[PDB]
Amino acid sequence: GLKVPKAVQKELPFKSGGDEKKARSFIQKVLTISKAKD
Amino acid sequence: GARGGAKVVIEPHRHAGVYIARGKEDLLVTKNMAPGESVYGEKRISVEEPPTKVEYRVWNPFRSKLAAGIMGGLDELFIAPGKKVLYLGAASGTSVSHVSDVVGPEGVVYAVEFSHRPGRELISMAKKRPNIIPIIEDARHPQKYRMLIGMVDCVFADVAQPDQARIIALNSHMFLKDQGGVVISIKANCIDSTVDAETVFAREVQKLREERIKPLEQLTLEPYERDHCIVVGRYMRS
Amino acid sequence: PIEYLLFEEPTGYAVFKVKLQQDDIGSRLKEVQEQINDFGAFTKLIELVSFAPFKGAAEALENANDISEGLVSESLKAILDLNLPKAKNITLAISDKNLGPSIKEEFPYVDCISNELAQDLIRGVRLHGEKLFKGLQSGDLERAQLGLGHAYSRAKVKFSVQKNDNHIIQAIALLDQLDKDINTFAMRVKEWYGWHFPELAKLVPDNYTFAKLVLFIKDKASLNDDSLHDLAALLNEDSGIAQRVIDNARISMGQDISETDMENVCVFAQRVASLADYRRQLYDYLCEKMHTVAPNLSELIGEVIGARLISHAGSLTNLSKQAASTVQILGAEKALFRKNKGRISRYLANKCSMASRIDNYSEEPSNVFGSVLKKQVEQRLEFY
Amino acid sequence: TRNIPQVSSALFFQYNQAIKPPYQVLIDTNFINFSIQKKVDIVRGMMDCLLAKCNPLITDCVMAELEKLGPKYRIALKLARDPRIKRLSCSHKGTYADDCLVHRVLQHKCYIVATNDAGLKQRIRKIPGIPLMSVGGHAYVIEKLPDV
Amino acid sequence: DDNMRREVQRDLLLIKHRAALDPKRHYKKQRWEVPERFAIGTIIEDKSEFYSSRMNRKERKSTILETLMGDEASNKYFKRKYNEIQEKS
Amino acid sequence: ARIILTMGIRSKASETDLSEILPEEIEERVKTAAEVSMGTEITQTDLDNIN
Amino acid sequence: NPKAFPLADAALTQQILDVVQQAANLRQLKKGANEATKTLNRGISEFIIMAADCEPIEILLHLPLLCEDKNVPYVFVPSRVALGRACGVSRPVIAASITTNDASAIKTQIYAVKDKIETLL
């Protein structure tokens, strides 16, 4: 990713467990296929 | 597919009084007017509501031609809450019960049947639904049962007869409101098996029009049925 | 040329007078059709002159039969005579063409109209309904139409409360619920009275018997030879419990409970007794109805078993419709019909399906076919 | 609610497997005039062209455009009212026919259209399974009817 | 209810991304948003459908995701996919 | 339940007095409902167990 | 009025007993009361045939209820005894069902007989 020089980064204007571990992975698991599938 | 433990999310359909149950499969369902029982052995959903156990019935599109129309994606369905509906050709409660569910307790369903044998089960269904009024009488003679039907907003006719247009008209003139709903189911083989389906449907939409019904829509019911359609129309007396 | 209009209401007959006649040439014009919808315009066309309510439910149906067959009832003859002038010929609007000749026969001086113009006025009356009756007591039409519905439609089919089989489904549902309740309350009675006299609980295992003994033996201290004979009469002395309870009651372990406590035990035990008494009455009830409702099915397998089969299918009409294989699995969860054993179970299932068909589709089913259809099963049983 | 009209079940792609003898033919206003010009009068002129029995239909509109034509086109009116010519009544406000004629074949894939107006021809060419019949030369010609 | 259960939220997420759950199942393209009003209901069998379409009591779970947990094929199917994607990433 | 004990059949409802059971406004509703009722006639064999 | 209604006349029975016969040859025919019910349950029955002299008749009056629910024609022949040979089978048949097949060699006279049966109904 981008590595902006610090001098540029200074001169910016302002605007710019257990069972669940198995059931929380499987959610972030399924979401990845659907994104890759689409 | 839809097996006993499987859990589903009930969310409303575009048409008022119609609901969708999501999951691995999507089901068309209507809330049960008489919870705790099935009318033709259909499938049911029970939801815990604050807690009261509200109950919802599965609408099988193959069995019900109207439900196939919803699957077909009808733009307008006059059958809606707080509306009077005249059901012609009511063989039994297979579809009328679902129509009874859509109209709700404020509404009523005027079910018309001819053959006595299906009528007995329809009457048995009619008791369980206080809103259904069974009329075991020939639809070809609306004067026979004018005594029993008040003024109705919409007419549903699934009569599989060659003279259905005459039956629809006479009932529409006697019972249907001005600007009221007309929704018909047509099978080509009974009316005319000699000629293709498409010419038949053209002929039927023609007959509705002399009778002062403005037809709005038509839907063939594939993949659920061959050689059907549902035509939706408005009755323009004036 | 219309003057009077005859309209039928489920509550009664109302005849109307046509004050103004709508334009006949321009009947199909937009504006005139709107006037039918508009109540204010319509009231100028017609006015209510009479209404004759039906005396009761019976009159509405027999008139409902008569209206349909194009016939004139005594009520129709009565109302019309007082209204239509004898008079060239007075003109009456009727929705039915078939009713016209009947009216003409009774009344030669009236000429009937059922043209679209007459239909137009009749449609408007139905549209507004009781709003045109201007306050006259018509109750409310909607339930009367609904009430006349199972009066009219359901008459033509010739059912009977004889046909009704819900008596069997609710009886079996109530019977099993009673069976659970009698056991639940009875077992409580053992606990309440167990504190006071526990070993009497083991002496009389039969729950129904124990409640009766507790009713007589409220206090274990009270022990007399005459009382021993009294409780000896209860059940029999073959088990010897009559002598045991006296010997036990003399040297016992149960802690005395208060008078109010004992009052609940016998009163609660009395409640248990009543439910069992009602349960046997309902059991005998279930037997009688099935012989009346399903003599073939009841005779083949039995009353209690058949009532359960009807409930599983949901109705006798249901049970008749399924194929034989479905009927066999309908009672495969409680072994109602139960390698060689399985053959008999299916064989009986085939015949049970037939008995439902005979019972369901016969207005007055008999047991002649059920009696024989059991006999072949007996021949079937002997060969295997 | 979005509406996406279904393609007619009478179509295997752009073949209409429903139109079979006898046919239904709609008549356009210009067609009667050109038929009179080439002296190919209506019913048999088809019968030679198609070798099948057809049912000519004149809409309330088309009977109306024929009648706006005036005294110069009287012959078209009497031919238009032949009893063998059935009538297709219309329930739309406008008397404009070219939108009237095409819109029916949009619904039901069971008609042929009779026309010589270039205004109306290509509209039928995009829509699939609508045979298109016209009068040219000395007799009628059918373009998108493979059964011929 | 406001502050909805994590269990209900995960069930909704499953329906939204229903396409990815099975390889041989495909669905119409839909932008499904959480409905403003909804309930959670259970499917009840007719007695005649005991063999055909009734799952065992042990298999039944209160929330959809646990039933997906019991299915071994879905777990095996997916463990392969998650490994394959991470290799590309 | 106490109503069913006083009136066994809707025909009895028209004349049976429900004052001790129901207030004046409610008791007339059941009477009016009885004549415009919907249910079918039941046998005395049936009526006995309902009581 | 009669429970066995409508009953095919002498002629109409012959054409029905004809279409029954080729169907047995072409494996389009399910015969017996329960098979008729099963073909009805799956909705593969284009029309059913039943016998009016069934002993007793009541054991086949379930089928009219099933068909009229779903709009399948049905018709009665005077003889269950006659309906046997048309099935090609060595015992009497009280009820039989011809099934739906648009891929059958014998479609044309089926729709001819199926045309007549509704006219009778």
Added chain:
RNA sequence: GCGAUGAUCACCCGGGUGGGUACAAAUGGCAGUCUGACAAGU
């Protein structure tokens, strides 16, 4: 002296394991019984 009004068609060594349905009991499991000096008025 037949039949469509229906013929035909899980493991181990008679026993033990394994599984399904319905009811009843558990003071068996989830499962762990909230905080603690200020509040109110002229």
Added chain:
RNA sequence: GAGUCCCAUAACCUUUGUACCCCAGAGUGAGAAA
């Protein structure tokens, strides 16, 4: 200071006892006996 308002008056799981079931299941559909 602080959720009665998602039955701790309860749901589910485990153990135990009682009574049935291990034939297919929208079960199949012409053989069986000699």
